[PDB]
Design a protein around this ligand. Sequence first.
Ligand SMILES: Nc1ncnc2c1ncn2[C@@H]1O[C@H](COP(=O)(O)OP(=O)(O)O)[C@@H](O)[C@H]1O
Lengths: 80, 415, 105
Amino acid sequence: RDNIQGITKPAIRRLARRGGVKRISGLIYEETRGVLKVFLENVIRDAVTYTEHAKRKTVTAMDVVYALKRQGRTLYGFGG
Amino acid sequence: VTRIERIGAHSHIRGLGLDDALEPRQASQGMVGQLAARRAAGVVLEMIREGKIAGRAVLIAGQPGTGKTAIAMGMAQALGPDTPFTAIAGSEIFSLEMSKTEALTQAFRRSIGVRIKEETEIIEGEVVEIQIDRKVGKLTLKTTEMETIYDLGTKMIESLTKDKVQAGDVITIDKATGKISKLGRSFTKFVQCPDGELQKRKEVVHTVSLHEIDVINSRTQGFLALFSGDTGEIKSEVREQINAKVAEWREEGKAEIIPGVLFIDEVHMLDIESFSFLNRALESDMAPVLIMATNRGITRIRGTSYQSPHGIPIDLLDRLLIVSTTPYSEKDTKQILRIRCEEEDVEMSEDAYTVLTRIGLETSLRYAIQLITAASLVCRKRKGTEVQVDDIKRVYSLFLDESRSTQYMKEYQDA
Amino acid sequence: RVLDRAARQRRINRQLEALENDNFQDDPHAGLPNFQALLEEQNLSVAEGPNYLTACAGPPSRPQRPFCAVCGFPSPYTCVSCGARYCTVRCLGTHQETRCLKWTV
DNA sequence: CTGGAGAATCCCGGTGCCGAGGCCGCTCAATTGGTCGTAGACAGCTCTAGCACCGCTTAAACGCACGTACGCGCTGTCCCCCGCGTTTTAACCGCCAAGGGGATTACTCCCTAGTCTCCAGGCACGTGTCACATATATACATCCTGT
DNA sequence: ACAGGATGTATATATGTGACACGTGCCTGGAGACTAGGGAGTAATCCCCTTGGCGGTTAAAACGCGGGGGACAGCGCGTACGTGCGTTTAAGCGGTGCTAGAGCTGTCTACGACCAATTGAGCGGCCTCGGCACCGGGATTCTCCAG
Ligand SMILES: Nc1ncnc2c1ncn2[C@@H]1O[C@H](COP(=O)(O)OP(=O)(O)O)[C@@H](O)[C@H]1O
């Protein structure tokens, strides 16, 4: 598959602009892609564990909320 | 799962079961009984490892099936690698592309190894970048501990342009020749990068036999031994000077010879012309200590109506040592059957063991060893776990033997 | 990263210049308390023909020896930072911790 | 440092779209009323630390003096990101079959687990030694002195 | 020059901490017999989707290019921080030597916990319609030469 490139250069540029950055290096995109991939992999692993425990086939949004809560990234707006 | 080599007829044999004083144990290393012949095998093996008194022949006589080949396989296993053990049947010398005498001397040479030491330097790392300026360039190699650049000379740039090797490939570079070899693309074919130093001196030793040297020094790219394209090397012109040059390598510090071992099975197939050649080929310095076996007694010699022991002329019979093997008893046969079962995954009962030992003492030993696996599989047919007496009886009924099949010939067939 | 070739050449030149600094190679203080000019006296109007300019030997025919920069032994390797050759991994480490893109000697 | 354009915002008024709010109607869950064992609070009692010193010893913090080495600014110039216009492309559709994949609800039932015993053995506590650290006779062992 | 005393000094032996291993007793697990309730295990409902292949269309990417203005290194140089050092300050390593104040034990209530009623929040289900979200200007307000 290898669709990690879905997070394209303009997306990372907008994410940086929102963060106060006004000038980005060329090698920043391949590093941001890997960082985001690791963060995802972790959160999705936690969510898939929570889902398998519940004997459910669908990864509910509350499972993602709990997975983020484990990493300290408490996300309000989806149930908790 | 299953390798090219499987459970053959001599797998249980792991070597000679002798002590430090060449005293055979009752049963060890897969060799049961056969005390006298096994210790004689030990003596010949010791005098072979010595490698001073060359040009000796031994003949393992005995009744058919009395471990005559088992002793040879055990000697081969005990001698271990790094020592040529050439095993050929008496029928293999009869060749159309070469004369029997030439094939025999070829086997002799094959049964003699030459030890040579090398001090080449081998590189082992991973490619980081390859450059080409149409010509000179630079090469950067990487290992888990260091990285370095390299100036791509004519030979290096040419070889790396001919080969598709590129950045990110664990490779080896013999600075002597420059042979490039890639063991796997990358991190995970793929394989990790090497460790330690990038360039390190490595000693290499090659136990090349006189046969290999002769074939290497006979023609332009004369290394055609892989298919034996050669019909016979030039005796006394390219075969005697190689001996002198090897002797020059010796007594100087360049090379040392390793006495091999030859095992001609079923020597009674050799004709009188082959025996005549052995009478003189076993009197030279570069002659291996060979062993042989024959199940026949005083039979006819292939070539004339003369009768002689082993079908071998008297002139050669008085030139070798005979090693007779005695017939096995109930104990030895039962222990051999047990070792054979241990070699495989079969596990027979005690009563089954007794029945199989009786069946193997009635007709012959090899018949029981063959029925072992048949009964093992018939047990798995009834969905059992242990080979009982009933399975062995069913097999004995299904599969016949030599003596019982010959007696069933009460109906005349073709002739 | 990797250093350019200008930096390596400047390092080589400055080291060769230090190799002829006779007064004091590192710190020429050692106490502060007809005055002709320096070698400039002729280095400013270098003549032609037989002179210290044309008297140079030139490039040799024997290729440079690949000797280590740390211990002074043969060095089949070359550091990517500044090209300084090294013999073993220990040499590369002792170099990187003493000479690198940041330090010269 | 102004002009002089020139885009970009950005007031400001306009207008339907649709979420926000509200109202209705039950369901369920918090209240009521009352009984019933604990929780823990409080009144002693014990004795363990905690605190408070004091003295002797000396490591250590410390100030000073004194270079060297590293920090900062400057400079040059030279690569590599920005701004912006063009070709590419993927992301939205829309299409055209015919039905299920799976959370959600629900009802038996039944193994599993609480509760609550009585015990007895296995783990906190007291005591017996043994490995490393300490302080001291000692048999020579090196200057000093009669000689 | 020597024969013997007058001091050192590692060397070998009996005495101080610690930490493991052992040995009793008393709490905490284990063992057993009842009694739910919880959860498993089908069996039904309601979602609203489901996939392949493929045609179409618009903007978000994707790419080209110029070029500018920043990212790097070199140069220099002037503080400034580490490096000894001589001083002195005060930690700390053992002591003594009280007293709060943990830690406990016991006692005995108020305080929860059910619990069976009772019932009114509160939750979903519709309806409605102001309120944000976007159009359309029209001023304004930065940005960028260009002088
Ligand atoms: N000493 C031994 N130990 C174990 N097995 C043996 C021994 N001697 C003989 N055998 C078995 O008995 C069989 C005898 O056959 P083999 O020796 O090959 O006959 P021949 O030597 O005549 O060709 C072999 O298959 C071997 O497995």
